[PDB]
């Protein structure tokens, strides 16, 4: 029945698989994965970003004790200081003769960089997660299907229902707690919400990028005004999204498990290249090519017509095909070690039809799964090589 693909997940490369179907004729795949997303039922705990000591304006009651009024930004460092004698033009702005108090207040406030090029924490749960694998079958058609956990939301994206395992993105490569810095996503703790203090990335907790309320301790320290005269000393130390960029965790857009990269995301895993994606689909007859084309492909033999030593597509091999009934026959190597560019290859009884492929060596004895019949296209060729070129079109690879 189902859409066989046992052939790995990559990205860049136009990599392929072959659907073993016996009720209908098999169908070729080009499994082009380059979009992968997670997206669970989640909750945004706080945007984070480094401080900006946008020195607030205190309600200085002046001398005889000063009381610090609660400003619309929760959590604030405020410290009375006496022994001042204010000046701001002329004289004191406090009501003692020179026994004046200056109540310095400084809270951490959202930076202008918080708005754009910032960090963003998440508690990442599961509720809506998706394993996304596009297959442009090529023999048939496109489908970019997803998986969904919540059942008031369709998982019938694509042609029908497509099941991945090892999943292509229904896991998170990052932890439950994740901090983010541009490209580099660090799967690293942060302190819950509404409690955060310095010594972590998430010490700043603004509920939005540019906010009105936040939780403001990033190791902001008021100290005694200089010269026994008014003003606000704000001593500010490093914080989340300043450090942890060289105190860094694992920078997932270059080190993600499941071969992915990550960025500022509502929780997604771009560009995955997981161990393998064994794709299995519950699809009608439309996703397959019909049995009338060939009930079973009866006889065939393959040999080169000059091949490649490379997983560039240029390898060719005639195949003296034969079939129970003549028609189309989608093809691809059933290991994907030869990645076949032919969506369909024609079969007539005792004819011969060349197909296109990419292999990886001078003697390409790769099976070709000619819609219910395998065949080795052996023969000596000339060796072209080029093996810096992107992720396998020979996938499942670990050979020459």
């Amino acid at each position: 029945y189902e859409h066989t693909a046992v052939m790995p997940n990559k990205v860049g490369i136009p990599y392929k698989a072959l659907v073993e179907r016996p009720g209908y004729a098999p169908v070729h795949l080009q499994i082009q994965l380059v979009n992968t997303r997670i997206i669970p039922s989640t909750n945004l705990e706080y945007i984070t970003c480094k401080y900006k000591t946008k020195v607030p304006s205190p309600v200085v009651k002046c001398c005889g004790a000063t009381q610090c009024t609660s400003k619309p930004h929760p959590d604030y460092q405020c410290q009375v200081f006496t022994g001042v004698y204010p000046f701001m033009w002329g004289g004191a702005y406090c009501f003692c003769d020179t026994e004046n108090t200056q109540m310095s207040e400084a809270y951490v406030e959202r930076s202008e960089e918080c708005s754009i090029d910032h960090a963003k924490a998440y508690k990442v749960h599961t509720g809506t997660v998706q394993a996304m694998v596009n297959i442009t079958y090529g023999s048939v058609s496109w489908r970019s299907a997803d998986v969904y956990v919540n059942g008031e939301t369709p998982a019938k994206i694509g042609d029908a229902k497509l099941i991945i395992g090892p999943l292509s993105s229904a896991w998170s490569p990052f932890d439950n707690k994740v901090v983010v810095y541009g490209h580099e996503v660090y799967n690293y703790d942060f302190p819950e919400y509404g409690t955060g203090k310095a010594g972590s990335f998430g010490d700043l907790q603004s509920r939005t990028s540019t906010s009105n309320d936040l939780y403001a301790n990033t190791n902001l320290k008021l100290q005694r005004p200089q010269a026994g005269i008014v003003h606000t000393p704000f001593t500010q130390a490093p914080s989340g999204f300043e450090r942890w960029k060289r105190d860094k965790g694992a920078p997932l857009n270059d080190v993600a498990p499941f071969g992915c990269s990550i960025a500022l995301e509502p929780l997604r895993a771009e560009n995955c290249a997981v161990g393998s994606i064994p794709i299995s689909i519950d699809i009608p007859d439309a996703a397959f090519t019909r049995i009338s084309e060939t009930p079973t492909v009866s006889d065939l033999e393959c040999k080169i017509t000059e091949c490649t030593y490379a997983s560039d597509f240029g390898g060719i091999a005639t195949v003296a095909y034969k079939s129970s009934k003549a028609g189309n026959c989608p093809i691809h190597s059933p290991s994907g070690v030869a990645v076949i560019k032919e969506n369909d290859v024609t079969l007539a009884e005792s004819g011969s039809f060349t197909f296109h492929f990419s292999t990886a060596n001078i003697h390409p004895a790769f099976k070709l799964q000619v819609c219910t019949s395998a065949v080795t296209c052996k023969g000596d060729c000339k060796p072209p090589k080029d093996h810096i070129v992107d992720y396998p079109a020979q996938h499942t690879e670990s050979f020459t």
Binding site: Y1, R21, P22, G23, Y24, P284, D285
Partner: peptide, 15 residues
């Protein structure tokens, strides 16, 4: 009917 219940496209009897 003899078969209803959303079909079984044959590659095997009742596949």
């Amino acid at each position: 009917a003899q078969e209803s219940g959303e079909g079984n496209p044959h590659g095997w009897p009742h596949e």
